[PDB]
Design a protein around this ligand. Structure first.
Ligand code: CLA
Ligand code: CLA
Ligand code: CLA
Ligand code: CLA
Ligand code: CLA
Ligand code: CLA
Ligand code: CLA
Ligand code: CLA
Ligand SMILES: CCCCCCCCCCCCCCCC(=O)OC[C@H](COP(=O)(O)OC[C@@H](O)CO)OC(=O)CCCCCCCCCCCCCCC
Ligand SMILES: CC1=C(/C=C/C(C)=C/C=C/C(C)=C/C=C/C=C(C)/C=C/C=C(C)/C=C/C2=C(C)CCCC2(C)C)C(C)(C)CCC1
Ligand code: SF4
Lengths: 742, 227, 40, 86
């Protein structure tokens, strides 16, 4: 058995600026220099396609490992900037005193060409752009009270950024791991589960118990931020902590004697929300992170490394075989330890799915104080993390297909699961095709039915709560079960996990933090639109993966590569047969689906959750008009788009006028993209010929011959501008709307 | 780990015995994580740096273990005034834990002298490891004659670092290197003991010993969890 | 150093420097001569 | 008086049982993995830790069964309190 050990090569690559001055050095095709403008685009498209530059897996792995330190270095610079701008260009200290009546702001524009109008009167004796990232609420939760603490974190971030960039250089040019080091998947999982996640959660729980809880307890009691003891005083003076939490008078003895009930004063199971801040109890989060730490530290001892005990991941996979699936999971261990693309396909799929879960769980169970009543931050965070998840999921389809074309090998996959999936791909795709048509007719068709009946003056014939009803009874049943959990199935929980299940609302600063969310006919219809749009996106992406190597149309698609434009006008025309083109079409459908998801979230929250609380009751921002209007297309066009676009198109002359400009700018970029999507390069190349003639006539023709974009780049440019314009349009529309009425 | 002396300690493994041949001082075959394996080694994880670093830690720890308890012992014996009878963590190294005012300058003035003094001492020592014998070449007020080293970074020797030229024979020098490393490893663990006991108890190392002897059953780590 | 100064002469780097300079010149002119609509 | 109490007895019993079970071939050890059928079988150990114990009981077994015993004991101790028995 190979011993798990450190293994590197000394000084593999000399540190020199020689190759910086030789563009295209990394590739044998491009290293000879440009002859046409296509070279310039090719230089950038191939820069990070490491496996296309060499076949040595060790060389690829080292480039991946150091590229990751580069990414981490950039993230630390980004984080350091956020903390720095919070320390130097914000109203955080003023906000801490009056969180409800002050708008977070951490960007200040210089006065030039009249742009200082963008420094709005956000409160706290401060002028600047109102941020929606939620950093103020994160900083308060961690117990930060002064600009000095923010400033010190920013310095430390730069030190970490330098360390990351040093590590990247060091581990590529000085001590580069060997291929066998990377292939210790058992050891990597043990460290990333027990160490990265387990210790990280334990350490953060340590910060929460000793810093976050004491500081936030005094803040929620009305204590002034400057009179709260500094965090190190809490650490060094057990007496101060024992005043806040009496169990601290007993030290760590209850933990070691298994008298864990003593810590019930700061390790709780309350549930619900803190009625002062509108966020989760921090004593609940601290117990959460303690429990998570134990779970992951246990998980980190599962795999065998060097001492006999533990599991062989190869032995687990090979054991799980059944009558219906041939050889089963044989060969997957080899694939997953030799293909980065296979690993990236799985990791992107779940990381993206995880991001979407974060979006849902954070709106329903707001973990930060004063997050719930900052409607601008709530809408932004949900939208942001939904989009990241969608983009990541599409990347999973792309890199699964890349594995299919480049790394898949039939000799190692005979009658196993991967081989058997390929051999009934027509059955898989044909059925998924039918499901999409069924879902399309019976979900979007219901809206078309409703629009027609309403236009004909037959409202009694519509699918609606006051007419033919479509109640989501299954979702309604689940809500009731979760609302009653504390009584029977979660006896030790004081309250339900979320107020969306049912019960009483929580109001903070005269506004609704969270309240029960009712599910009617309109909610039934929109959920089956979501089912429809997701299934089609899967169809496009899955088809690209399963037919990446061949089809009945192109029997030898694998030899044509992952990314090619077509195989000619023959066979009736074969434009966009390649797997890359399926990712291209999948992006549009991913954009179409997640647009409706966030429109669903925006309208539902404004109509039925968010609002002001007074003696007369709760008045929602749009007055509960989602239920009766959201069941027609005209309802969405009128009551959502037309009505709620009032803020953005009326923002000129105010601090929000930048959103008005971007709103129009994004419409422009979107329409600009249709030029690339609708046309073909053959037209543009012929146009460039005439323009070249004019430059020749004047002796000003370039030496690098102008060329129209390649067919594939024309598509890449088209979708990139389509997405940027479409998303940036909704971005401006959301922020101008919510920062104004929120 | 097997204390005392043994042919091999508890953690010794057949894997570690491939490269741990006993030549190095203190080689008891204890390398469960295999950090001294020469094959495919690099960076700071290599036999020369790791062995050099252990000796360096051992020597600093031996000074620290004796220095972190000496003021309390001499203060108890009355050999020094009670004003200087202070716990090692209250001397000003950690001002939040307490500081001593009465030095001829503030600790930040003293610290600058430490930086300059240690930069010279440390960077010159580094150059002898990177370029053996290089510290005996360039002029250093005539002191370069004692900075030639010996080819082994951890044991420079010479007319000063080996002032009384002890360990003249190979067998004698080998015996002394073993004694240096075993006292050093004991001191390193003692320093770790001082740090943990300070956090656990808040008292000095000498008080902890006195109280444990007074009533061993009621004074120990198990009873120090509570208060 | 020759290679590094060669790297600084590549098109993207030259474009960055030149446009940073050109933008700085235009911004600074509008800082000292604000709101120019006509030539007088 | 923690020593001799119910919690102390359970923790000592659980850790002793796991150490005893592993040492006498009643639980998996460093030199004995388990198959899919829950049957002990000679394993392949990369490190090959040395032990003078007649049965080849290494320090890793002590750590493995010590941790397993503490998990078993802690679950029982907290479990019995949950139902009120302890
Ligand atoms: C994600 C990273 C990031 C981003 C996008 C920004 C963006 C910005 N910063 Mg910030 N900054 C960051 C990180 C970041 N910073 C970090 C890590 C530090 C610590 C070194 C700072 C320190 C800093 C200072 C000291 C200042 C800014 C300022 C600015 C603004 C003007 C910059 C400019 O035009 O420079 C000019 C362009 C070139 C030199 C080219 C701009 C909004 C300025 C500001 O807010 O003015 C009111 C300002 O004075 N930043
Ligand atoms: C000053 C130190 C230094 C020097 C002289 C070199 C030199 C070299 N490196 Mg090394 N390297 C360094 C630092 C250095 N490296 C660091 C810090 C890392 C960790 C990230 C690496 C990681 C690394 C890898 C993984 C590889 C090299 C390679 C190379 C060779 C080609 C470099 C090249 O073409 O760069 C020109 C490239 C650039 C200028 C791109 C810079 C990208 C960085 C991350 C900054 C991007 C930030 C930017 C803001 C991104 C957003 C842009 C947006 C705002 C528009 C060459 C021998 C390559 C090779 O072939 O080696 C044999 C190779 O594969 N290096
Ligand atoms: C990783 C997370 C973490 C960390 C770092 C801490 C840290 C701390 N906790 Mg907390 N705690 C945590 C998680 C954590 N806790 C969790 C999850 C819980 C819930 C069960 C608690 C519950 C809890 C309670 C109830 C109490 C603490 C207390 C403490 C403090 C004293 C601990 C103690 O007695 O240590 C004992 C000894 C050690 C930890 C060993 C220290 C070893 C040192 C660093 C060695 C240094 C050696 C080196 C050679 C020195 C060189 C010196 C140089 C100048 C030369 C300490 C600040 C106590 C306190 O007073 O809080 C204010 C306290 O009453 N904690
Ligand atoms: C962890 C994430 C991750 C990683 C490490 C990679 C890595 C890789 N991908 Mg994959 N990919 C990902 C996510 C990821 N991908 C996602 C989320 C998607 C879905 C969109 C894809 C879709 C995808 C495709 C379709 C392809 C790859 C390809 C590649 C390879 C070459 C990349 C390259 O050279 O880019 C060079 C980088 C550029 C040319 C810059 C692109 C910038 C975009 C177009 C616009 C950015 C706009 C910006 C965010 C906002 C506006 C700024 C502006 C106003 C200034 C490389 C192995 C290529 C390949 O062939 O692999 C074998 C390939 O064809 N990826
Ligand atoms: C509004 C624009 C629009 C419409 C209506 C469609 C419609 C469709 N697309 Mg397309 N698509 C669009 C834009 C649109 N697309 C764009 C812009 C792109 C480029 C990115 C694509 C790219 C694309 C791909 C790549 C795929 C689709 C797919 C589909 C089908 C999904 C299954 C379905 O719902 O079938 C049912 C049809 C509908 C829901 C449309 C409306 C049906 C009406 C309401 C029925 C009326 C019936 C009535 C009796 C009419 C009588 C008329 C007269 C004879 C009297 C469907 C035919 C997928 C597919 O084929 O899946 C099998 C697929 O793979 N589309
Ligand atoms: C993804 C992160 C990562 C990974 C997987 C590795 C992996 C590796 N590194 Mg690299 N390294 C990294 C990040 C990483 N490095 C960074 C960020 C830096 C810059 C500081 C370096 C600098 C670096 C150097 C200079 C060297 C390595 C070496 C190594 C190898 C041995 C590591 C070892 O012995 O660790 C085991 C750990 C130790 C021996 C002790 C580390 C103690 C640290 C400094 C403190 C504790 C850190 C902890 C995570 C957080 C503490 C929090 C709080 C309690 C204070 C191995 C291939 C060595 C090598 O090439 O060997 C052939 C080597 O010489 N790395
Ligand atoms: C590296 C280890 C180390 C370090 C960093 C310290 C650090 C400290 N010790 Mg500790 N100590 C150590 C080891 C160490 N000690 C050891 C091993 C012992 C046991 C012998 C002691 C015994 C000890 C005692 C008894 C006391 C300290 C004290 C101190 C503190 C004040 C130091 C001072 O005043 O120096 C003063 C400076 C010097 C001694 C060096 C003189 C420098 C001049 C410029 C040289 C002039 C040379 C010239 C040619 C004249 C030579 C004359 C000669 C031939 C007669 C300080 C926190 C004191 C304390 O805690 O006070 C509150 C204290 O009372 N230490
Ligand atoms: C003497 C033996 C003994 C006894 C009497 C108990 C008794 C108890 N244990 Mg304990 N336990 C023991 C041994 C024992 N345990 C041992 C040896 C271990 C292994 C270390 C554990 C580990 C353990 C854990 C981890 C937990 C308990 C819990 C409990 C209490 C509630 C269990 C319950 O009703 O769940 C009823 C729950 C369900 C029917 C549904 C659970 C659904 C899960 C959460 C979702 C699964 C999702 C899936 C993985 C995807 C109960 C008093 C629980 C507790 O303390 O609750 C307050 C608890 O969390 N025990
Ligand atoms: C349901 C299907 C269960 C299927 C199920 O439980 O299968 C389980 C069944 C068990 O097979 P084996 O016992 O041989 O499995 C051994 C495993 O270790 C895998 O090798 O697997 C198959 O038959 C494989 C092909 C199933 C193909 C199913 C086609 C129908 C898919 C319908 C999708 C509906 C999605 C609804 C989402 C809410
Ligand atoms: C017979 C004999 C002997 C003896 C021995 C002994 C006496 C032993 C002991 C041993 C022991 C006595 C051990 C122990 C161990 C322990 C451990 C290793 C522990 C662990 C733990 C853990 C891991 C925990 C965890 C946790 C936490 C922390 C929290 C909560 C949760 C849990 C519980 C999970 C000798 C060798 C002398 C000689 C020969 C014969
Ligand atoms: S139109 Fe373009 S993509 Fe389609 S077959 Fe012709 S050349 Fe290929």
């Amino acid at each position: 058995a190979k011993k798990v050990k450190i293994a590197v090569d000394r000084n593999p690559v000399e540190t020199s600026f020689e190759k910086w001055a030789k563009p295209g050095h990394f590739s044998r095709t491009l290293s000879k220099g440009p002859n046409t403008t296509t070279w310039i685009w090719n230089l950038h498209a191939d820069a990070h396609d490491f496996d296309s530059h060499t076949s040595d897996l060790e060389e690829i792995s080292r480039k991946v490992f150091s590229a990751h330190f580069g990414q981490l270095g950039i993230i630390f610079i980004w984080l350091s900037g956020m903390y720095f701008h919070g320390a130097r260009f914000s109203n955080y200290e003023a906000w801490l005193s009056d969180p409800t009546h002050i708008k977070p702001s951490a960007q200040v524009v210089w006065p030039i060409v009249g742009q200082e109008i963008l420094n709005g009167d956000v409160g706290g004796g401060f002028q600047g752009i109102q941020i929606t990232s939620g950093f103020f609420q994160l900083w308060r939760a961690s117990g930060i009270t002064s600009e000095l603490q923010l400033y010190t974190t920013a310095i430390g971030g730069l030190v970490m950024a330098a360390a990351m960039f040093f590590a990247g250089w060091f581990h590529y040019h000085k001590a580069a791991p060997k291929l066998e080091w990377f292939q210790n998947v058992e050891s990597m999982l043990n460290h990333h589960l027990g160490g990265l996640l387990g210790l990280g959660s334990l350490a953060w729980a340590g910060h929460q118990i000793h810093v976050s809880l004491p500081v936030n307890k005094l803040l929620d009691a009305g204590v002034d931020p400057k009179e709260i003891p500094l965090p190190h005083d809490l650490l060094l003076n057990r007496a101060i902590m024992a005043d806040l939490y009496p169990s601290f008078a007993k030290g760590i003895a209850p933990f070691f004697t298994l008298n864990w009930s003593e810590y019930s004063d700061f390790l709780t199971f309350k549930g619900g929300l803190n009625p002062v801040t509108g966020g989760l109890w921090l004593s609940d989060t601290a117990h959460h992170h303690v429990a998570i730490a134990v779970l992951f530290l246990v998980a980190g001892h599962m795999y065998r490394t060097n001492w006999g005990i533990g599991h062989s991941m190869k032995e687990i996979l090979e054991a799980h075989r059944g009558p219906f699936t041939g050889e089963g999971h044989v060969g997957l261990y080899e694939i997953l330890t030799t293909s980065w693309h296979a690993q990236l396909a799985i990791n992107l799929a779940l990381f993206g799915s995880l991001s979407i879960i974060v979006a849902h769980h954070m709106y329903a169970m707001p973990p930060y104080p004063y997050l719930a009543t900052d409607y601008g931050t709530q809408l932004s965070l949900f939208t942001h993390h939904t989009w990241i998840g969608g983009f990541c999921i599409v990347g999973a389809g792309a890199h699964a297909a890349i594995f299919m074309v480049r790394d898949y090998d039939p000799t190692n996959n005979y009658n196993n699961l991967l081989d058997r999936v390929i051999r009934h791909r027509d059955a898989i795709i044909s059925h998924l095709n039918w499901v999409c048509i069924f879902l399309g007719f019976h979900s979007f068709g219901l809206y078309i039915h409703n629009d027609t009946m309403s236009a004909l003056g037959r409202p009694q014939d519509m699918f609606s709560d006051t007419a033919i009803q479509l109640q989501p009874v299954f979702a309604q049943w689940i809500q009731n079960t979760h609302f009653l959990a504390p009584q029977l199935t979660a006896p030790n929980a004081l309250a339900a996990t979320s107020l969306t299940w049912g019960g009483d609302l929580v109001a903070v600063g005269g506004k609704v933090a969270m309240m029960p969310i009712s599910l009617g006919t309109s909610d039934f219809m929109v959920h089956h639109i979501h089912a429809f749009t997701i299934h089609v996106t899967v169809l496009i992406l899955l088809k690209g993966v399963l037919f990446a190597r061949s089809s009945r149309l192109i029997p030898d698609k694998a030899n044509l590569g992952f990314r090619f434009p077509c195989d000619g006008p023959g066979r009736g025309g074969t434009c966009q047969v390649s797997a890359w083109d399926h990712v291209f079409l999948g992006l549009f459908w991913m954009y179409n689906s997640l647009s409706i998801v966030i429109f669903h979230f925006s309208w539902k929250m404004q109509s039925d959750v968010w609002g002001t609380v007074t003696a007369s009751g709760v008045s929602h921002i749009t007055g509960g008009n989602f239920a009766q209007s959201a069941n027609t297309i005209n309802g969405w066009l009128r009551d959502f788009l037309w009505a709620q676009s009032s803020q953005v198109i009326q923002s000129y002359g105010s601090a929000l006028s930048a959103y008005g400009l971007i709103f129009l700018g994004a419409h422009f970029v979107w329409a600009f993209s249709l030029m690339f999507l609708f046309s073909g390069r053959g037209y543009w190349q012929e146009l460039i010929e005439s323009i070249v003639w004019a430059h020749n006539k004047l002796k000003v023709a370039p030496a690098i011959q102008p060329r129209a974009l390649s067919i594939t780049q024309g598509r890449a440019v088209g979708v990139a501008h389509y997405l940027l314009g479409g998303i940036a349009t909704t971005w401006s529309f959301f922020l101008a709307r919510i920062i104004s009425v929120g | 780990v097997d204390r005392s002396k043994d042919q091999l300690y508890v953690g010794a493994s057949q894997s570690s015995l491939a490269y741990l041949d006993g030549s190095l001082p203190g080689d008891f075959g204890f390398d469960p994580l295999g950090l001294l394996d020469p094959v495919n080694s690099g960076g700071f994880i290599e036999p020369k740096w790791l062995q050099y670093s252990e000796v360096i830690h051992a020597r600093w720890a031996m000074l620290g273990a004796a220095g972190c308890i000496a003021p309390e012992v001499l203060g108890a014996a009355g050999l020094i005034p009670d004003a200087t009878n202070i716990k090692w963590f209250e001397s000003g190294v950690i001002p939040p834990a307490g500081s001593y005012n009465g030095y001829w300058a503030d600790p930040y003035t003293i610290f600058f002298v430490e930086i300059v003094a240690m930069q010279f001492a440390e960077l010159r020592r580094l150059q002898d490891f990177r370029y053996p014998g290089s510290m005996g070449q360039q002029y250093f007020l005539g002191l370069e004659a004692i900075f030639k080293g010996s080819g082994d970074a951890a044991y420079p020797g010479g007319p000063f670092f080996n002032l009384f030229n002890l360990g003249k024979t190979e067998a004698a020098m080998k015996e002394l290197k073993l004694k240096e490393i075993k006292n050093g490893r004991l001191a390193m663990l003692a320093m770790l003991g001082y740090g943990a006991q300070a956090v656990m108890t808040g008292k000095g190392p000498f008080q902890n010993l006195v109280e444990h002897l007074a009533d061993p059953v009621n004074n120990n780590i198990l009873t120090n969890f509570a208060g | 150093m020759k290679d590094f100064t060669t790297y600084l002469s590549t098109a993207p780097v030259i474009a960055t420097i030149w446009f940073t300079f050109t933008a700085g010149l235009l911004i600074e002119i509008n800082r000292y001569f604000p709101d120019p609509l006509v030539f007088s | 008086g923690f020593i001799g109490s119910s919690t102390n007895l359970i923790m000592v019993a659980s850790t002793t049982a796991t150490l005893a079970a592993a040492r006498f071939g009643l639980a998996p050890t460093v030199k004995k993995n388990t198959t899919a059928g829950l049957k002990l079988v000679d394993s392949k150990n990369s490190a090959g830790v040395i032990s003078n114990d007649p049965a080849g009981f290494t320090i890793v077994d002590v750590l493995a069964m010590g941790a397993a015993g503490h998990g078993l004991g802690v679950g029982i101790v907290l479990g019995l309190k949950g139902i009120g028995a302890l």
